[PDB]
Enzyme design. Structure first.
Site, PDB file in Angstrom:
ATOM      1  N   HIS A 189       0.800  -1.213   0.000  1.00  0.00           N
ATOM      2  CA  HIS A 189       0.000   0.000   0.000  1.00  0.00           C
ATOM      3  C   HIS A 189       0.848   1.284   0.000  1.00  0.00           C
ATOM      4  O   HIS A 189       0.293   2.357  -0.223  1.00  0.00           O
ATOM      5  CB  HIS A 189      -1.044  -0.002   1.121  1.00  0.00           C
ATOM      6  CG  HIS A 189      -0.536   0.266   2.506  1.00  0.00           C
ATOM      7  ND1 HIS A 189      -0.402  -0.757   3.442  1.00  0.00           N
ATOM      8  CD2 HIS A 189      -0.295   1.447   3.121  1.00  0.00           C
ATOM      9  CE1 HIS A 189      -0.023  -0.169   4.563  1.00  0.00           C
ATOM     10  NE2 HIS A 189       0.047   1.156   4.420  1.00  0.00           N
ATOM     11  N   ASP A 212       1.365  -7.649   2.648  1.00  0.00           N
ATOM     12  CA  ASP A 212       1.536  -6.228   2.368  1.00  0.00           C
ATOM     13  C   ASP A 212       2.986  -5.815   2.243  1.00  0.00           C
ATOM     14  O   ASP A 212       3.549  -5.244   3.175  1.00  0.00           O
ATOM     15  CB  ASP A 212       0.808  -5.401   3.434  1.00  0.00           C
ATOM     16  CG  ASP A 212       0.437  -3.982   3.025  1.00  0.00           C
ATOM     17  OD1 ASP A 212       1.001  -3.481   2.038  1.00  0.00           O
ATOM     18  OD2 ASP A 212      -0.411  -3.371   3.702  1.00  0.00           O
ATOM     19  N   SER A 252       3.754   2.466   8.576  1.00  0.00           N
ATOM     20  CA  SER A 252       3.541   1.511   7.487  1.00  0.00           C
ATOM     21  C   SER A 252       4.860   1.282   6.759  1.00  0.00           C
ATOM     22  O   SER A 252       5.519   2.239   6.401  1.00  0.00           O
ATOM     23  CB  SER A 252       2.560   2.087   6.478  1.00  0.00           C
ATOM     24  OG  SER A 252       1.224   1.903   6.905  1.00  0.00           O
TER      25      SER A 252
END
Ligand SMILES: CNC(=O)c1cccc2cc[nH]c12
Ligand SMILES: CNC(=O)c1cccc2cc[nH]c12
Ligand SMILES: [Cl-]
Ligand SMILES: [Cl-]
Ligand SMILES: [Cl-]
Lengths: 695, 697
Positions: free
Chosen positions: B64, B206, B632
């Site tokens: 992402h 991810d 992230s």
């Protein structure tokens, strides 16, 4: 893994002792003496119940005594939402049409039945499974006027193992069974429909009744002179609770299982029964939900109808999950291949012939069965105007004496029941358009109920127009339309009524399909007798239980949780803290009783909380249960009552075909939570005092 | 509470970290005067975190985080977003426009310098102590005249910490040639998709792979076909030993924002204004959108992204309000301030109690204004699409009032109208959303506080909101394509001045700006009082178990690989496996589709050296590390500093952790490095990436 016959206790005893059973064999089940078995009852023909005092007090589920709580409820004293606690025996409420059945004696009558059956002639006779035939044998064996010499007693013979074993049951039935106590619906049905088939569970699913009898403890219908029954056996209540891995056992009346299905029968259950029910109810429920969410008055009228459709929908989703993920089809295929190989070795080909006959019958009835489930799910239960009034021949041979008014009064009564306070013609039109669009896509023109052929012939395939025209021109389309008919009634108007023609047409097709499908059950049943006989001769009547058939069975296992999916574990016990976490005042299902909320806040748990101070609510166990086991007593290794069975998790509903050790659990209300509610919510000390509570 | 620590704080935290399981030497993790593991950490594209994993500048981050770059290189011919991308040679790696990776070269405490510069005060109420312009002027003064010219690739920045009680200068090295190297298909990279956002257990792979390029000498250089892969100072070793329950774990990254020093009055305001309004308003918006998407499959296509975008912060607000309601956040802030007030009373220094009082008073005073701001922002600015419909500019209106510049103005208005009424805009769906959102807005905001055009609901339409919204579209130039074209053929200034949609849009934007401007002056007394408040907290309990709020600067956090109980009788373990991916498989749901190469790997058990001791293939794990947005892609390290995973999310039960860390609920959701290496190997077949990494047994 099984639902064992009481006769099988002897052969299972050693294993039960290894798993933790401490009580003596004959104290649990004695074929010729008193035992714990004498404290289990069939409550109101479906549920299980249990005697818990020397004065005939009976515990069962709240959902088992629900109709009796509702029948005694008024706007003045709403026992359903408030609970009911009779503070004296004289205050206990009688119930009309209630019964409790005790299993007095059980005998193996296989040789008797098999010898009587030899006087056959027709080798394809179904008398070996006929209740009428078996009752004639039961009356012959019991005696001429048995019920008159032994009042309150009755006999019954049932087939087991597909007609390979027969048992005669001597039953004692009591019909004066009074309501004693019940928690409010907020406790008795805490999860309501959201938590149905769900573990973890926080529902206090219990209700209390009492068996009444004459002066001598003999069955008697309701009479103000009836005295509470002094039973020969009642359960002691344990307060020691449960721990993970504890031995647990249940006695009850499981209704039905399909343990001896062939692989072809599992495929059929999936691809016809379950897939059609899932797809059709999803369409019905989707339209109902849109309408209930948009109009709060529609939500009031359709909530019960929506909830009733969701129950078997959820079961079908759970069962199809087991077929897809637990290898049910493969294990049935392995079961039959092993019998076929053993039969080949012994030179007996009748078992392979039997499995082939079942496969062939299943394959032959496929289109018929698909058409039956499609009409039953799609129209008979899917569309409300399918159950609209159909004039009888008595009512038509009255509209053409002057009892024409009597004919119209009977039609009006039925019309009023169809178009009742909860019926919305607008909601029904929307459901019918979506259900018929799906039905017309799956069922070809030549297989349609005659009136549905008009969709293509008269309405150019416009389903909305067809449904609109049924209501616009039918005398049951509105109150004004019925009244205009009732003022000038003619048989010619009823014979050409679009709603009457629809309802008649779909019922004609539903009956024609049922009648055409009925003859396929018998070759399957006869082949199952040979199939199960082979399985029993090969692997023994030891780790292969007979299918449930609403007769008394025992099951045993342990208090144990399970992992429902990757990285998620559900423990063996829920607490009162879980009730409080789920509290939602603006949702009728998750409302918490204020007396119970106060109990939790003060920690007024008395002798009912565990060693850590947390108040238990429910636990789950690896016992093998099904519908019919609601209200079943759950026993300790010493036979003391530790809970009541009230549900099973959706992951285990495929357990009716193949028991799932790692997923299937019985959902049980902890007896300590039952006592906490009687004591701190009901304040009914007399019920606690009459029970034998062991420390 | 648990902490997002400054690098400077490693020294005083080291002993506790070693007692919790850390085995590496202090200066191997961070050394102010030498190479350490800190040098392998980057700020990936100004938001995410990333990490260098090879001597040739290979960088790992989340899928992402590299999503926009995967999407920009995707075509109908080569859909890298859907199938994955695996460059089989360095020359095949794709360059990216507007990408950057920032290394934190040096970090220096400049508190005494900044505080001495601040003493040249021309106003005690000055906000220069928090001004990026002011602090940059001090950073340039300290670095020297023409530092950027004399050190190409480097830049200096000073930030305030602890509410203006500590200052750090960061020397950053920025690289702008960062190329796409590898990415799994979206079915792996975003497996949970929106259904599993903020969810533990999690089964999402991810990750995405990039490479830093530089000139011949390893110095920053923009994209050039002559650029060579960067040979970095330090890179992480990949561990294949996996994780066990209770193992020590740590993360370095750039957490964006926290509110650890909120007063109890600020927690109440966050709940009763910010979160309750966002929850209620988005629930109305989402409810109408859902009914329309369920009824028309074409509406589902057009509104899916809009619906998913609104649900993200809605879910966060539900999670945060659950913590305020159940974890005692308000009470713990009240206890924190009462303890400081009591200590200040004994020291005979009343300025801390005065500071907490100033914050409470400011919060109480701005209550109605803040309620009106969130009500318009959630209810109309975000809630209603025709609120962002075209408003003719002063120069566009001037052009329409004797030249050829009228057609230029009409072309500009048309371009904005086509962006508003695009392929995903449904005027019918928007009218339905507006009727429900305005009905709620009109119930909460009184007539005297309404944006001027909304007064017409009561005055001209007899309170019929449906009629008011119907009339906006029926008479507006932007109500349909034919209505715009009729206007564009005969355009008059008067038609735009009286347009009901223009008047609505102008009115709600005027009120949104008036409220913002009236609320802005309330931030400063709170900020100034927070400087005194946090100084007291630090003087009283020390800069030891009280971390400075996150501010997009480099921090470390440590904890253990541990699951948690979300509710009664339910336990979630510390690790998910590839079996959990297979359990969730649904071919008729784009979110839960399973890649066929990965499905085959699972069936054959082709797990190589990546499976755990029991032959189970690990996917993700969770840890008690303290993370937030900005983390992230963060590297997750072992007790030896080896890479064991990449942080990619946090569970909803822990979102209140931005105010108060929740030990029994809050977890960082991490993709296991063994699953990353399995996907590169068995799904991408990109052996060269495995070979250039230093994989330790
Ligand atoms: C919201 N969903 C449900 O409640 C549901 C759906 C399908 C099966 C089961 C079994 C139990 N609950 C179920
Ligand atoms: C699909 N997920 C939801 O409906 C949802 C709703 C509210 C809070 C959270 C946190 C995570 N998911 C949430
Ligand atoms: Cl008895
Ligand atoms: Cl002071
Ligand atoms: Cl916590």
């Amino acid at each position: 893994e099984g639902m064992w016959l009481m006769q099988q206790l002897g052969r299972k005893y050693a294993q039960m002792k290894e798993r933790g059973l401490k009580m003596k064999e004959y104290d649990l089940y004695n074929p010729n003496g008193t035992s714990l078995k004498d404290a289990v009852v069939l409550f109101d023909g479906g549920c299980t119940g249990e005697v818990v005092s020397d004065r005939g007090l009976v515990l069962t589920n709240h959902h088992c005594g629900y109709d009796m709580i509702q029948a005694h409820s008024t706007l003045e004293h709403n026992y359903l939402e408030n609970g009911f606690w009779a503070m004296r025996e004289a205050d206990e409420l009688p119930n009309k049409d209630i019964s409790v059945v005790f299993i007095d004696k059980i005998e193996d009558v296989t040789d008797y039945v098999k010898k009587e059956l030899k006087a056959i002639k027709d080798p394809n006779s179904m008398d070996y499974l006929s209740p009428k035939y078996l009752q004639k044998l039961a009356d012959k064996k019991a005696g001429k006027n048995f019920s008159a010499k032994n009042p309150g007693l009755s006999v019954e013979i049932k087939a087991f193992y597909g007609g390979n074993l027969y048992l005669m049951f001597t039953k004692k039935t009591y019909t004066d069974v009074r309501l004693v106590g019940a928690p409010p619906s907020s406790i008795g049905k805490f999860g309501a429909d959201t938590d149905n088939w769900i573990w973890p569970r926080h529902t206090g699913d219990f209700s209390i009744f009492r068996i009444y009898a004459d002066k001598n403890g003999n069955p008697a219908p309701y009479s103000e002179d009836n005295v509470p029954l002094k039973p020969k056996r009642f359960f002691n209540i344990s307060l020691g609770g449960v721990q993970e891995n504890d031995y647990a056992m249940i006695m009850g009346f499981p209704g039905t299982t399909h343990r001896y299905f062939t692989a072809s029968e599992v495929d059929e259950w999936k691809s016809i029964d379950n897939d059609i029910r899932i797809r059709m109810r999803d369409i019905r429920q989707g339209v109902m939900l849109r309408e209930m969410l948009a109009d709060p008055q529609i939500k009031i009228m359709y909530s019960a109808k929506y909830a009733a459709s969701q129950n078997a929908y959820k079961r079908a989703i759970g069962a199809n999950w087991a077929i897809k993920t637990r290898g049910l089809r493969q294990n049935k295929q392995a079961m039959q291949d092993r019998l076929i190989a053993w039969g080949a070795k012994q030179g007996t080909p009748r078992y392979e012939e039997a499995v082939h006959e079942i496969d062939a019958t299943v394959a032959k009835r496929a289109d018929l069965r698909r058409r039956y489930w499609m009409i039953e799910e799609g129209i008979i239960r899917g569309i409300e105007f399918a159950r609209s009034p159909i004039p009888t021949e008595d009512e038509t041979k009255a509209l053409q004496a002057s009892a024409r008014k009597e004919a119209i009064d009977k039609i009006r009564t039925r019309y009023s029941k169809f178009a009742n306070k909860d019926y919305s013609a607008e909601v029904d039109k929307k459901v019918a358009v979506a259900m018929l669009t799906e039905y017309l896509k799956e069922i070809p023109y030549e297989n349609l109920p005659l009136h549905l052929r008009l969709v293509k012939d008269r309405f150019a395939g416009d389903v909305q127009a067809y449904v609109d025209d049924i209501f616009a021109r039918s005398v049951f389309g509105s109150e004004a339309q019925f009244d205009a008919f009732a003022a000038v009634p003619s048989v010619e108007k009823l014979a050409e009524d679009p709603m009457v023609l629809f309802a008649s047409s779909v019922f004609d097709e539903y009956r024609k399909l049922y009648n055409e499908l009925r003859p396929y059950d018998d070759p399957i049943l006869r082949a199952q007798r040979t199939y199960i006989a082979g399985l029993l001769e090969m692997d023994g009547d030891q780790d292969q239980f007979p299918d449930a058939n609403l007769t008394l069975r025992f099951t045993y296992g342990q208090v144990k949780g399970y992992s429902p999916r990757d990285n998620v574990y559900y423990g063996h016990q829920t607490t009162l803290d879980g009730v409080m976490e789920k509290e939602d005042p603006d949702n009728w299902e998750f409302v918490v009783d204020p007396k119970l909320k106060a109990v939790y806040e003060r920690k007024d748990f008395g002798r009912y909380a565990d060693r850590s101070g947390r108040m238990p609510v429910a636990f789950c166990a690896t016992t093998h249960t099904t519908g019919g086991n609601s209200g079943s007593p759950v026993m300790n290794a010493n036979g003391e009552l530790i809970g009541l069975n009230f549900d099973r998790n959706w992951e285990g509903v495929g357990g009716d075909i193949q028991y799932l050790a790692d997923y299937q659990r019985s959902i049980i209300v902890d007896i300590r939570y039952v006592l906490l509610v009687i004591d701190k919510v009901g304040g009914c000390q007399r019920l606690l005092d009459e029970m034998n509570i062991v420390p």
